[PDB]
Design an enzyme around this catalytic site. Structure first.
Site, PDB file in Angstrom:
ATOM      1  N   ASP A  34     -38.248 -37.582  -4.549  1.00  5.03           N
ATOM      2  CA  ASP A  34     -39.041 -37.118  -5.435  1.00  5.03           C
ATOM      3  C   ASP A  34     -40.543 -36.785  -5.093  1.00  5.03           C
ATOM      4  O   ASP A  34     -41.133 -37.829  -4.686  1.00  5.03           O
ATOM      5  CB  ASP A  34     -39.052 -38.033  -6.434  1.00  5.03           C
ATOM      6  CG  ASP A  34     -39.970 -37.450  -7.682  1.00  5.03           C
ATOM      7  OD1 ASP A  34     -40.271 -36.270  -7.706  1.00  5.03           O
ATOM      8  OD2 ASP A  34     -40.606 -38.286  -8.587  1.00  5.03           O
ATOM      9  N   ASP A 220     -42.431 -30.062  -6.567  1.00  4.09           N
ATOM     10  CA  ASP A 220     -41.664 -31.144  -6.917  1.00  4.09           C
ATOM     11  C   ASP A 220     -40.301 -31.040  -6.917  1.00  4.09           C
ATOM     12  O   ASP A 220     -39.442 -30.510  -7.927  1.00  4.09           O
ATOM     13  CB  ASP A 220     -41.920 -31.259  -8.492  1.00  4.09           C
ATOM     14  CG  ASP A 220     -41.640 -32.390  -9.408  1.00  4.09           C
ATOM     15  OD1 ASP A 220     -41.016 -33.378  -8.572  1.00  4.09           O
ATOM     16  OD2 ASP A 220     -41.573 -32.460 -10.461  1.00  4.09           O
TER      17      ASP A 220
END
Ligand SMILES: Nc1ncccc1NCc1ccccc1
Length: 377
Positions: A34, A220
């Protein structure tokens, strides 16, 4: 780096995970990769959706930091106890490092029923690390303690079961064709970058580029969608809507309130526009564009229980956190997070899903004036 190629797995919509080992002897967990957060947090309790979880009592090298962390979202949350222990990545470099670990002891809407990961690896920067920037992120720990170079690259594919590669410490030239182009990392918190121009099929949006990066544009891996801010989403939609007017669809579908469907072997790719984001380039007045296809923003809903057709979600969606270049964008490209040079490089991915007409492209240089005005303050 052969050793790291293909070290990511996942399932559609449930993100990309890498195997890691924590503690001595090593406990193997699958951890979510992430780039939109900066915490290393594993499940530490037998939540029933978890395949595995961190058992601190089994690890001789564990050390309690005697502090907690509460981390809310909308309206997911996780909550944990900070510590440190020896982390390793089987299909990463051959190192073992002492990193901070949040033992997740309570969560809501965090873990995904069905998923095969049990923790999160926040790879973005310390400024957004909970509880505060004192808590050194994993990657800071890895570079600080080894000769591993301050950079990592991500190739997210997705063919169901998805796959990818996270090359820790370098770049694998086999993973991309043509050339890398680099956009500056505007600040080291999230991986923030500045979009300077947006086209749909070629025709730009003539919209004050500042709205494209209001209040942020980030990269992201934690998000599936391309998420555009309020107005930009509006404007893009209208133009995608126009461009695409060979057919008509419900208003809900555009808002991600509905799915839209065709039959097996019967989707009209071409009736859909390409999307180009021009990103601030390395030099003054210099930009480059990344171009995705609709095979990147129309993603199939893997299994829709009340339907045997081909459906798809509209993977572009609105935001107030900012622009969010998620799976939709990153699956088009090989993405190099050159932390060492405060910049993110993009190259056409050797594994992206093109047809025989169109292709994802990274192209430059273009001449774009006033690129610093697109950033917000
Ligand atoms: N990076 C990111 N982006 C949006 C929402 C959350 C987020 N990080 C936490 C996260 C938890 C669970 C799955 C995916 C991401």
């Amino acid at each position: 780096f052969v050793e790291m190629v293909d070290n990511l797995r996942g399932k559609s919509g449930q993100g990309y995970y890498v195997e890691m080992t924590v503690g001595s002897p090593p406990q193997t967990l699958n951890i979510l990769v992430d780039t939109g957060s900066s915490n290393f947090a594993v499940g530490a309790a037998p939540h029933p959706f978890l395949h595995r979880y961190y058992q601190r009592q089994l690890s001789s090298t564990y050390r309690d930091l005697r502090k907690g962390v509460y981390v809310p979202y909308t309206q997911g949350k996780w909550e944990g106890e900070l510590g440190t222990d020896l982390v390793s990545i089987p299909h990463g470099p051959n190192v073992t490092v002492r990193a901070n670990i949040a033992a997740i002891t309570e969560s809501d809407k965090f873990f995904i029923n069905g998923s095969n990961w049990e923790g999160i690896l926040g790879l973005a920067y310390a400024e957004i690390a909970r509880p505060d920037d004192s808590l050194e992120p994993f990657f800071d720990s890895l570079v600080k303690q080894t000769h591993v170079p301050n950079l990592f690259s991500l190739q997210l594919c997705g063919a169901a079961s998805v796959g990818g590669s996270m090359i820790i410490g370098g770049i694998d030239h086999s993973l991309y064709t043509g050339s890398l182009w680099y956009t500056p990392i505007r600040r080291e918190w999230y991986y923030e970058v500045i979009i300077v121009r947006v086209e749909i099929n070629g025709q730009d949006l003539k919209m004050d580029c500042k709205e494209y990066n209001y209040d942020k544009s980030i990269v992201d891996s934690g998000t599936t969608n391309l998420r555009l801010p309020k107005k930009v989403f509006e404007a893009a939609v209208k133009s995608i809507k126009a461009a695409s007017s060979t057919e008509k669809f419900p208003d809900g579908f555009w808002l991600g309130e509905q799915l839209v469907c065709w039959q097996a072997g019967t989707t009209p790719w071409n009736i859909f526009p390409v999307i180009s984001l021009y990103l601030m380039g390395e030099v003054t007045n210099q930009s480059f564009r990344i171009t995705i296809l609709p095979q990147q923003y129309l993603r199939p809903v893997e299994d829709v229980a009340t339907s045997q057709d081909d459906c798809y979600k509209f993977a572009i969606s609105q935001s107030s956190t900012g622009t969010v270049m998620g799976a939709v964008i990153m699956e088009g490209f090989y993405v190099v997070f050159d932390r060492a040079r405060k910049r993110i490089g993009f190259a056409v991915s050797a594994c992206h899903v093109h047809d025989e007409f169109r292709t994802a492209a990274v192209e430059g240089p273009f001449v774009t004036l006033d690129m610093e005005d697109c950033g917000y303050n």
